[PDB]
Write an enzyme that holds these catalytic residues in place. Structure first.
Site, short mmCIF file in Angstrom:
data_model
loop_
_atom_site.label_atom_id
_atom_site.label_comp_id
_atom_site.label_asym_id
_atom_site.label_seq_id
_atom_site.Cartn_x
_atom_site.Cartn_y
_atom_site.Cartn_z
N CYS A 1 0.81 -1.21 0.00
CA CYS A 1 0.00 0.00 0.00
C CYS A 1 0.85 1.28 0.00
CB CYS A 1 -0.94 -0.01 1.21
SG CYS A 1 -1.42 -1.67 1.77
N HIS B 1 -8.79 3.28 -3.39
CA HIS B 1 -7.47 2.86 -2.92
C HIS B 1 -6.81 1.93 -3.92
CE1 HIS B 1 -4.09 1.68 -0.75
NE2 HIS B 1 -4.62 0.96 0.22
N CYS C 1 -0.75 3.39 5.92
CA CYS C 1 -0.43 2.09 6.48
C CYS C 1 -0.14 1.11 5.36
CB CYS C 1 -1.60 1.57 7.32
SG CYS C 1 -3.10 1.21 6.37
N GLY D 1 0.32 -3.13 4.26
CA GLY D 1 -0.01 -4.52 4.57
C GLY D 1 1.23 -5.29 4.98
#
Lengths: 390, 389, 393, 391
Positions: free
Chosen positions: D89, D347, D377, D379
């Site tokens: 991400c 996203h 954040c 993963g």
């Protein structure tokens, strides 16, 4: 001297590829027409001695059992034998012939012939999946298109129709006029309610959706719709288009047959009796004229001639071969496919032969005719034909 | 009263799954046995009036045309009609019955029945490929295993055999002894050369395959008894050792009307006397042969004691032992040269290839009557009776 | 104060052959193994690692999208450490080491791990029509290994790119086959003399058969002859071809990793480094001539280091193909005795995303063995790039 | 003391999964933003010294070359090195950080950082196809979902968000209000034309279609749209729904950076300078709070504090973790994602970090602020954060 009589005949409406029946498996389409055919015949599933179904494309593992699954889920007793047959485009009429044969030879008194095909749900195969591709791009094989290609020459059935158009001198103009007329005849037949009785609704689940009308037909078709289309199958001097070729389609159908004296016993009025049938092989490249020798064999065996026929269901796989067939046999076009056929109503391969038998017999009754012919060409170079008498 | 006579019968050797026939498609297996059967019969492909072939698993697009492809590529005239049939494990005998029916009803005087199956080349399906999976893991469906699962209950044929073993009281010890014996019989038969005549070599320098490669020539009883039940978690009896193999093969017979054969001066192997079909509970499919065989016997006016040779396919020792018990068959006469457990079980071909075995064995021992019968997935049985000469 | 990166340990797996000894070991596990063992050899706790970067080109499973993180954490690196996966194709493994060094140079951390892992055995097939459907017509299962080995602009195999570079730099079939033979001879000699013993971590698979340990580079042909090469036919082009299976690199599985730290952080710990990083260089070239990528990259690195070719004692210059490997040494005027002295991609193998890390491991151990001063590591990159780094003992 | 300045930033509109960009590959999305970013910067592709692109899901073989393909097809010289990076991400912002690093260390004076992701065109894998399944049903593996599951525990990112909601006491009601607000803010921003400048149209081919509006956003959303939804990720006690989680999405973005003195030489007015960045690892099970430690590192390195920040782009992966991040850092919600984020706009994993950098810098200029934070954040348990200053 035993005789086969048809006591009921029913079909689904013919769905278009990716259309109204996309989510209904052949097994369920087959069980539906079996159940409804038995009900229409007023015959218990406990009394059925044999079931034969036609099907060409295996969509799932159950389809390897299709005859059995359609039988048992349609309420036929587990004690009945159940067969699945594959003579490609002819499979549906073959099923009815094989089922009749079990009655003729005294194996049973009551049998069901039908066909079911879902070209919407035709699979892709992965032939490298079991033992591995190892290295290099691998294939997902379209098994619907597989059904539509000749196994010797790997040409589409449509290029075989070009061969037949060439050999029998059927022009583009003739094909497109035949295609337009098929749609006009189908549309007229739907509106006049000719199909109402024979069609079993398929209902799925705002609320409930019921599919009961043949959705391939174009009610507003014009000749320019045909003539603007380009040949699809061949690169030069082509005549066969998407407009004057049969559709890709989903459907099922079934008939209940029994020995003449069984029907009398039960006090059932038959739709018709089976008079004769015929099978022929022809050149794979000219498969479209298969009906010509098959029909001649059936006529011979019946001691009949063309002029004796009041109603003819001769599947329109392509206007090219359909026109050739009627020309070569010297059929009267007014009596051939009077309510449309494959081009307008559709061509659900393995069901087609069963469903146009259902059409033929209901039409025969409607016009109070005597003799019906049902016949169709078969991929790989074959023809099948049967003759019925009301 | 037209009569059907069998004028020749031939089969491939039975290949093992992933084995000697892995690279030979059903179409080619079928064309081979068709060509060789016609040669053996001294009959021209130009004279064949119908061809029917059994097959359950479509391995490629051509397999939708299998009858027609095996016919024409085997030298049958394009003018002959050609049919593929599917009654699962019974398909091969059904093909022979359907072909005989075209003769009996006067549609033709000469027909070919056969079967071809390649379980090696059974496909995986991708049922989400056409219209998409969209989101979430999707399946590649093993169509071989598909053939081997009941379509109502989604249970393996082998759990159906457990049901039959339970109902007819066939112990693990029985089933393993029957399995060992099938291998011993098959091995003896191969070595004594019983199959030599009926087998057509497949040649792919060259490798030439002509021996039934599933058989275990050195099998012992401890080989069986050490194996664990495969099909059910608890209280199981059916193992890989006392169940039939997965296999590749084809076979074909040339039939004609009695008076045709006389005309041609051909000595038949046998005549068709009768046949019988039955349905049964899907969960107990393995005993399908019992009612089918009783129908065939009735129609023939015969009884069990009249039978000199019996080919009753060993799909599982569990159901095979049940069938012979229920019919009161003499185990010495049933599958005298092995069957599905030892030789293999190439589903759609099996019924045609054990008909070939039965007729050649009938001639070898100069017997009178042969029974061919087998159980069918989904709960059926099929049986036919033949008489020599 | 000006910060300096030092390499404190370097380890690799043995290089497996395609379909060979490492067929059943995923990149994630190959990576975790070399991370754990590198840290042990460095006498550094996983709790003290500040960054991890891994190179990898082919995603074999979903975890490979996390490779750097999975190799780090499963190798005993703290969950508190950032972890990156990078892809510069054939250069990935050296890029990982460069990116990791950069985090130290810029003061983001004092301790970092660069590595690479690749399993070409476990490369997937894709089904690009599966999600939204093919509708009608045959569809494709796409071999993603071969995908890695084709140029994305011209859809030609790397090998035809090597034919272009053989043509332009006049490297004959005979030259390529001799270079290929020599790479095998050098690799075989090196294995037997035990040169690789120290740097190789064993992979041991435990199974229902007890334990299997793989610790020897299995691509090498110890009995190769020149007539083995010369009898082979060109594979990549259908006229005038020179590049064969024998004088092209193999398809291979492997991983490797190095532990780096700031110079003063090694001194603090009392660790003797294998070497320091002196410079690196990156270049882009014509995609059709990608094999000579090392030439401009190496010139950049030499310039930045204030060095020349004669300063170099050991050179790892990946043999993707003898065609381009010969061209690179000719164009740079390298001495063939110093270039790939213990074999390279043709003999030992070319596990794409790991290769740059694993030949850095080879270079630094060889540098120490011969007590040389300067090592060059460089390789060509698919799509038309080169990467090079220079180390000092 | 070399300094990195951003001279242009552009993105595509964010397509929805199966939506307007379903037929446009990452390579083409990337080339488009590269070409347009260079044009906006008035910089020749011949003068670019490095290109780095973020991407997580390989959709085709070319995606193994993505950075190189997006570069060269976007008009960057073949002489430029080109890198693809994957920090999940965070990939998009990592690409911008890696590109900036090549400038800071004097490897070049001009570089491009970007990201491209097509979750629409995420593949299925067939892991048995190469060596065979032999017997038994085999798998087609959804690689998009693969990206969205933790590699240690094989749990969806969304169950990780439930852990964070639990630990930081973020209620269902809080998450749904935050989700509603994100849609409201995004809708307001689209209508007021805030995104007009930064968005490069994608025009594909019954004639030409042009896509230039963020199509995930729900302009008519109500709170009872949120509250009627059921938890999707956990069996009992769940708070995370489809409505208060980020979408699945397609997009790309790119920024052109150069050394401060290069921009001056060229007479280019930068959007901003890079001040600092920060990376953190955290518990995989609580990956959603990755931004907290990463942002603290970046603030420390910049000598700044929270109150200094005028604009904050902190990716809404889930309202659960987004609310936790702002609470833990003590951010003012008015300044955080003022024009929507992952819940509303979408996203697109590997592009997201680049495209919210593009948002942050254009917003920073619009409100004439000083400092921007970009953070998200990651993963597997990470965070990444960067701080920019409008000079």
């Amino acid at each position: 001297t035993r005789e086969v009589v048809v006591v009921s005949g029913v079909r689904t409406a013919i769905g278009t590829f990716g259309g109204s029946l996309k989510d209904v498996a052949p097994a369920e389409l087959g069980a539906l027409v079996v159940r409804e055919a038995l009900a229409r015949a007023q015959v218990s599933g406990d009394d059925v001695g044999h079931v034969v179904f036609g099907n060409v494309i295996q969509t799932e593992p159950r389809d390897m059992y299709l005859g059995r699954v359609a039988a048992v889920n349609g309420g036929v007793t587990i004690n009945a034998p159940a067969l699945t047959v594959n003579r490609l485009c002819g499979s549906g009429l073959q099923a009815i012939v094989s089922a009749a044969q079990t009655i003729l030879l005294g194996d049973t008194d009551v049998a069901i012939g039908g066909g079911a095909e879902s070209m919407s749900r035709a699979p892709y195969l992965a032939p490298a999946a079991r033992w591995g591709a190892r290295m290099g791009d691998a294939g997902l094989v379209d098994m619907m298109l597989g059904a539509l290609h000749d196994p010797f020459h790997r040409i589409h059935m449509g290029v075989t129709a070009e061969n037949v158009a060439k050999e029998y001198d059927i022009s583009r103009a003739q094909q497109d006029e035949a295609a337009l007329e098929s749609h006009r005849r189908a549309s007229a037949a739907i509106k006049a309610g000719y199909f109402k009785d024979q069609i079993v609704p398929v209902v799925s689940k705002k609320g409930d959706v019921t599919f009961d009308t043949d959705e391939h037909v174009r009610h507003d078709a014009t000749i320019d719709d045909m003539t603007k289309l380009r040949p699809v199958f061949v690169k030069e001097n082509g005549t066969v288009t998407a407009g004057n070729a049969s559709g890709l389609n989903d459907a099922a159908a079934a008939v209940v047959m029994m020995e003449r004296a069984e029907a009398e016993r039960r006090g059932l009025k038959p739709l018709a009796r089976l008079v004769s049938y015929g099978h022929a092989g022809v050149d794979p490249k000219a498969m479209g004229i298969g009906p010509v020798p098959a029909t001649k064999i059936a006529l011979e065996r019946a001691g009949l001639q063309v002029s004796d026929l009041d109603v003819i269901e001769a599947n329109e796989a392509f206007a090219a071969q359909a026109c050739a067939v009627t020309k070569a046999l010297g059929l009267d076009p007014a009596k051939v496919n009077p309510n449309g056929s494959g081009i307008s109503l559709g061509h659900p391969i393995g069901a087609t032969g069963a469903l146009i038998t259902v059409k033929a017999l209901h039409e025969l009754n409607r016009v109070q005719g005597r003799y019906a012919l049902v016949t169709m060409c078969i991929g790989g170079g074959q023809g099948i034909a049967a003759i019925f008498e009301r």
